[PDB]
Write a protein that binds this DNA or RNA. Structure first.
Ligand SMILES: [Zn+2]
Lengths: 91, 69, 147, 114, 120
RNA sequence: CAGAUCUUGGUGGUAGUAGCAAAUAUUCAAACGAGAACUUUGAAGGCCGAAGUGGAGAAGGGUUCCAUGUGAACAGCAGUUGAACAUGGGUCAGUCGGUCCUGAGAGAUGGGCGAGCGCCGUUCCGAAGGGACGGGCGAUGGCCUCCGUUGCCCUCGGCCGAUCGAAAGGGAGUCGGGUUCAGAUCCCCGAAUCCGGAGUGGCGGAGAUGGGCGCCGCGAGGCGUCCAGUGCGGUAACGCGACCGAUCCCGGAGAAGCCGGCGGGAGCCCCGGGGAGAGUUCUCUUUUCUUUGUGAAGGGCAGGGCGCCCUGGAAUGGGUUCGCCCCGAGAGAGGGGCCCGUGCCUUGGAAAGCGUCGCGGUUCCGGCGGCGUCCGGUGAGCUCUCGCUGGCCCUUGAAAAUCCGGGGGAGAGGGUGUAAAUCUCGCGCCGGGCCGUACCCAUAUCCGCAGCAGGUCUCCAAGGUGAACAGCCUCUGGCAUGUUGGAACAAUGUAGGUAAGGGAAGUCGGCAAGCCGGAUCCGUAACUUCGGGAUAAGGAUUGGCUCUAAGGGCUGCAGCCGACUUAGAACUGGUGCGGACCAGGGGAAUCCGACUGUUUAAUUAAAACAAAGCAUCGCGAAGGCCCGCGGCGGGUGUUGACGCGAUGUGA
C-alpha cells in the first residue's frame, strides 16, 4: 500500500520488538483477523471470537478451529485419514 | 389519580359507599370536581359551567364538602 | 475455558433412565461445530468427535481425550494440539498400544474411550507473545507463577 | 448553577446508585434514583441472536404484579422465544417434526419390505 | 463586554493567526469538517433522486465519487450534475440526428426501387 | 554515702534568651461590656475562583450536636468567643439501610489422625428427604350439611450437602410542599405505592349463557325436548380486561470486560423578544443585574429502535453510514407489529411554590387582598442518560436468594341456570414488628502523644480567556492569612529580580541560572529493524481596525432565516503584536542496557531485577515437583507433554 513498504499490518507495533519477530507475527496477524467464508451458509462472515473458536454471521454456527486459522494441515489430513479408515473398516 | 370523562359514572362513584368527600373547584376556564374515593382521587373536568351547576345539584349523597376557590 | 486454549464443547444428552437431560463438557475435537450429532458408545462407528472404545477401531484412528484406566472419564492427551495414535491391538488380554504426544508407547488396556480426532486450539504455540504485558495477562488467569 | 447531593446514605458510584434529574413544583432541582432497566426474554432455542419481540421487558421481580396477557404472546408454544424464535423456531419445530415422523413411517415400511 | 467582544470576533476581528494557540485540527477537527461536507452532499443526492432529476445509475455512480471526494462542495456538485445532464441531452440530440438521417435515405431507397421498377 | 553515663522526687545558670517568619490583607463606625489589634452588626478593599478555603457522604470519632449562663483552669498573646466549663434539650421510617442471598473464603457432626486441649477435611470411608397434590381407614369441630383439623395406611420426592461470609455486588415498594432553639424521602398536609393477609367468595366483571326442534302467538316469548359451551380477533408479527391445572420437564430474567466512533432525550450553558423589582445617568446605553416552575404514579402523544411480518422479485446491480455494512437465505419499494418512552398534553393542579404591589392580626399568624410565573431561537458546547455499530485478547469478562414463560394434561364441573375457576379484571376490608437515623467528614470534631504545612475513600462543578477541568480574573457559596500585634528597614540569611563589556576563562563537572518554547507557512541530514530518526536542524509571519470571496439548511429558482470557521486585501501604531498567561536549548560522538515496566518506605532509580526471544532437565498420575506432627492427608489439579515442575542466558 501507499502508506508503507513492507510492514503490512504489524506497523501498529511501532519500532520495537525487533525484525524477524514482526515478520513471524505479520504472517499470522492477517490470518487471524481476516474473515473466512462460512462453508455452511456461503456468506463472508467467519470470525475468531477467541483462541481456537470460529463464529459465523448469519447461520449463527460456531466451529472449533485452530488458534490462528480455521483448518490446520494436521486437522485436515486427520479428517482424510479418518475417511480412509472408515472406508477400510466398512468395506 | 384518575380522570372520569363520564358524568354518570362520576356520579356512581359519588354515591358509592366509600368516598370520603368531593371538592368543587372553579376557575374562569373550567370547573373540576374531585371525589376522594377510598384509594383514588377521581377528578371530573366540566368545561360548561351551566351543566356544571346542574351537576353540582345532581350529586346526591350526604358528602358534599368542600367548595373551593 | 479460561486459562486453556482448547475450547470446550458443551453437549446435551438425553438421560436414558428418567425424563431429563445431562449436559457434559468434552474437549472439542477439531472441526466439530454447533448442531452436530455426536455418537458415543461401543457401536458408534468412525466419525470425527464421536467417541468409541479403543480397541474397536483400526490402527491409526487419531484420538484425543483418551482414558488412562477404564472409567476415568477421559484423561490423556487433551491439551491444545495433541493426539495419540493407536498402533495395533492384542485381541486377547485386551491390550492396545498407543503412541502418546511425547513419543512414549504405552500399552493401554482396551475398552477405554477416546474421542476420535485431534484437539482443537492447535497451532497455538507459533505466535511470539511479543510483550511482557501479554505474557502477564496469559498467566494471570491460570496461576501465580509468571514473573 | 445548582450543585446537587446524593439523597441516600451512599456517596459512591455503583450500579444500584443511579440517578435522574427532575424539577419539583417549588422550582428545585432534585435527584431521583431510577430502576435499572432489563431485557425481554430471549431465544429458548439458543441460536437466534435476537431477543423476544412479544413481551414486556422489566425487572424479573416486577412480574409478580404484571398482567398475565402482557407477559406472553397469544400463540401456543410461545412467549418463551425471541422474535426469530417466535417465528422461525416455531416453524422449524414443524418442518422438522412432521417430515421426520412421516419419513420414519416410510422407513418402517422399508424395514418391512426387504 | 463579553457580548461586545464576541460580536466583534464573529465579524472576524481578533482571530488572526496571532491569537490562535493550538492546532488547526483543534480549532475545528478534520472529522467534523468531513462529516459536515458529506452529510450535505448525500442529503443533496437523495433529494435529486426524489425529484427524479437523476435516476439510480447516476445516483449510485455519484455516491462513490462524493465519498472519494473528487467533488468538494455543494456548488461543485450542482455544476457537475447540470453539466452531465447537458451532456446526456447532447448525446440524445446527436442520436436523434443519426436516426433521422438514417431513415430518410433508408426509405428514399424504397421509393427509388419503385422508380427503378417503373423505368424497367 | 559524694560519686555507680546510680533510682525517685525537687531546684538553679543558660534566660525574660531562643523564639510565637509557609501559602498576598487588611481599615472605618458602633452595640453589649470594668474591659476590644481579635466578639457582633454596617461599610470598604482583598482571597478560595466549581480539580473551591462550597454544598453532602462512607469509614472513624461519640455528644463534639442545639439553646442558655460562667468566664476559675485550656484554646502556646488576648479574648465578652469555642471545639473549654455548667445546666437544660435533640436522632420518630412497610417504601432510607441492616436483616435477605452468594462471592474469594470461613467453619460443623459422619470419617480420619492425635498421649491431648484438639487438628485434618467440606462430599470425600456416611441408613443424610420430619416434605407433599392426591386415594383409603380412623378421630373429630360447625350445621362432623358438607367444609375445617388431626392420627393411621399408600403413593411421590437427588441427601445431589449444617452455617456464616458484601451498611459499595444481586435485593420487590415514596414523592412534592410545610414545620423546628437542633430531627426529616421519618413529624404535619396531599397524592401513591410493594408484599402479605380476607380459605366465612365482600362487592361487581369474565366463565356464559344459547342451537335445533313441534305447539299458543303478526310479533315477542313461551311450553317440553334434546344437544355445545375450561375465552375472543386478525393470513403474519401480535392484539382485546381477565381466558382452568400438579408431580414432572425445557427455558427466561437475576447475569457481565475494556476502548474507539455516531446518533436520540435530558439538565446546564449561549442568543432574540417580553414582563416584574433593582444599578448607572458628569454625557451615552428600547440599557445592565436577579427572577420568570409542575414530582411520584398513571391515561395519551410524539420521539428513538428491530436480525419482526405480508405483497412482489433485483445486473444497466442496487441500498446506505463518520467509518462499515446487507442482498435470491429476498435489494430497494409500499402496507403493518412490537420494545423503550425520563421528552410533550392532562389527571396531581394552583388551592401548593415563587416574584412583586397592598391591608389588616399590628404581638403568635402555613393571615388575608391584587398582578405575574409569557413567546421563540441555538449547538461538533459540557454533564448525565438511552441506543446502533465497530476494535482488542495465548485475558472472554461472579454467583446464588428471587420471580417468570412455555411443553403435558394426573384432575376438576355443570345439567340448561349454572359450578369449579379467574398468572393480579375493576373496586372495597385488614397488617407490615426489630435495630441504625444529631453532628465533623478535615490546613478544628479521624490517624499521627497538639486546633500539627504529613495521611485518609467518593457525588456535584458557573462566565471570560484559551485546545482544555492547563494558568489568570470574576459570579452562587464561604473566608479573616492559618499558635500574636506595634515601630523601625543594619549585617548575615531565606525566596525572588536586574546588569555595562567578556561569554564557562569559574569548578571535580555549565551544579545553579540563563536561552528556545504556542500557532501557520516553508524545510530536512547521518543512520536505520523501513514504522523511524522528527517539533530534527534551519527561516519567515503573528497586534489593532476596515473590507472582499468561500464554506448552510427550511417552504431550477424565488422567497425565509440563522451558526461559526477559513483564505485573500487595504489602512493604522516609537519595529509592536503566543505582548499577563500558558509554553521543547541544539548538534556531531563514546560506554551500558533492547524498549515500556519494577526495586533498596527513611542517603544508592542504576549498568541492578524483570522482561518477551533462546536453550536446557525431570514426569505417562502406583507419576514430576512440593507442604506436612499425623491418615485413603494437601497444592500444582475445574490439570495431562502446544501440560506442569527446575534452571540458565536475555529484543
Ligand atoms: Zn455461516
Amino acid at each position: 500500500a501507499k502508506r508503507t513498504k513492507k510492514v503490512g499490518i504489524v506497523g501498529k507495533y511501532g519500532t520495537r520488538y525487533g525484525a524477524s519477530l514482526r515478520k513471524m507475527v505479520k504472517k499470522i496477524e492477517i490470518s487471524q483477523h481476516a474473515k473466512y467464508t462460512c462453508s455452511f451458509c456461503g456468506k463472508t462472515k467467519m470470525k475468531r471470537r477467541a483462541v481456537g473458536i470460529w463464529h459465523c454471521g448469519s447461520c449463527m454456527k460456531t466451529v472449533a478451529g485452530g488458534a490462528w486459522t480455521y483448518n490446520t494441515t494436521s486437522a485436515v489430513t486427520v479428517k482424510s485419514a479418518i475417511r480412509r479408515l472408515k472406508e477400510l473398516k466398512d468395506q | 389519580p384518575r380522570k372520569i370523562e363520564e358524568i354518570k359514572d362520576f356520579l356512581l362513584t359519588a354515591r358509592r359507599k366509600d368516598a370520603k368527600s368531593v371538592n368543587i373547584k372553579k376557575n374562569k376556564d373550567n370547573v373540576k370536581f374531585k371525589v376522594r374515593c377510598s384509594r383514588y382521587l377521581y377528578t371530573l373536568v366540566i368545561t360548561d359551567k351551566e351543566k356544571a351547576e346542574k351537576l353540582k345539584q345532581s350529586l346526591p349523597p350526604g358528602l358534599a364538602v368542600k367548595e373551593l376557590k | 475455558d479460561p486459562g486453556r486454549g482448547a475450547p470446550l464443547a458443551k453437549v446435551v444428552f438425553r438421560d436414558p433412565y428418567r425424563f431429563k437431560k445431562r449436559t457434559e463438557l468434552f474437549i472439542a475435537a477439531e472441526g466439530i461445530h454447533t448442531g452436530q450429532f455426536v455418537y458415543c458408545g461401543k457401536k458408534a462407528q468412525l466419525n470425527i468427535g464421536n467417541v468409541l472404545p479403543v480397541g474397536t477401531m483400526p490402527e491409526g484412528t487419531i484420538v484425543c481425550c483418551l482414558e488412562e484406566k477404564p472409567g476415568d472419564r477421559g484423561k490423556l492427551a487433551r491439551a491444545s494440539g495433541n493426539y495419540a495414535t493407536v498402533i495395533s491391538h492384542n485381541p486377547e488380554t485386551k491390550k492396545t498400544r498407543v503412541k502418546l504426544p511425547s513419543g512414549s508407547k504405552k500399552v493401554i488396556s482396551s475398552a477405554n474411550r477416546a474421542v476420535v480426532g485431534v484437539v482443537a486450539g492447535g497451532g497455538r504455540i507459533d505466535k511470539p507473545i511479543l510483550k511482557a504485558g501479554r505474557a502477564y495477562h496469559k498467566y494471570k488467569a491460570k496461576r501465580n507463577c509468571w514473573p | 448553577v445548582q450543585r446537587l447531593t446524593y439523597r441516600r446514605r451512599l456517596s459512591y458510584n455503583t450500579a444500584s446508585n443511579k440517578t435522574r434529574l427532575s424539577r419539583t413544583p417549588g422550582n428545585r432541582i432534585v435527584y431521583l434514583y431510577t430502576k435499572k432497566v432489563g431485557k425481554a426474554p430471549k431465544s429458548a432455542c439458543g441460536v437466534c441472536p435476537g431477543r423476544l419481540r412479544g413481551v414486556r421487558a422489566v425487572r424479573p421481580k416486577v412480574l409478580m404484579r404484571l398482567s398475565k396477557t402482557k407477559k406472553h404472546v397469544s400463540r401456543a408454544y410461545g412467549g418463551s422465544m425471541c422474535a426469530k424464535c417466535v417465528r422461525d423456531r416455531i416453524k422449524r419445530a414443524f418442518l422438522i417434526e412432521e417430515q421426520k415422523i412421516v419419513v420414519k413411517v416410510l422407513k418402517a415400511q422399508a424395514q418391512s419390505q426387504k | 463586554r463579553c457580548r461586545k467582544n464576541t460580536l466583534a470576533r464573529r465579524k472576524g476581528r481578533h482571530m488572526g493567526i496571532g491569537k490562535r494557540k493550538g492546532t488547526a485540527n483543534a480549532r475545528m477537527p478534520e472529522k467534523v469538517t468531513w462529516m459536515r461536507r458529506m452529510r450535505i452532499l448525500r442529503r443533496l443526492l437523495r433529494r435529486y433522486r426524489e425529484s427524479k432529476k437523476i435516476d439510480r445509475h447516476m445516483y449510485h455512480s455519484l455516491y462513490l465519487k462524493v465519498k472519494g471526494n473528487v467533488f468538494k462542495n455543494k456548488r461543485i456538485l450542482m455544476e457537475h450534475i447540470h453539466k452531465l445532464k447537458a451532456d446526456k441531452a447532447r448525446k440524445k440530440l446527436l442520436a436523434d440526428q443519426a436516426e433521422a438521417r438514417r431513415s430518410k435515405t433508408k426509405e428514399a431507397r424504397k421509393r427509388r426501387e419503385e422508380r427503378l421498377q417503373a423505368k424497367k
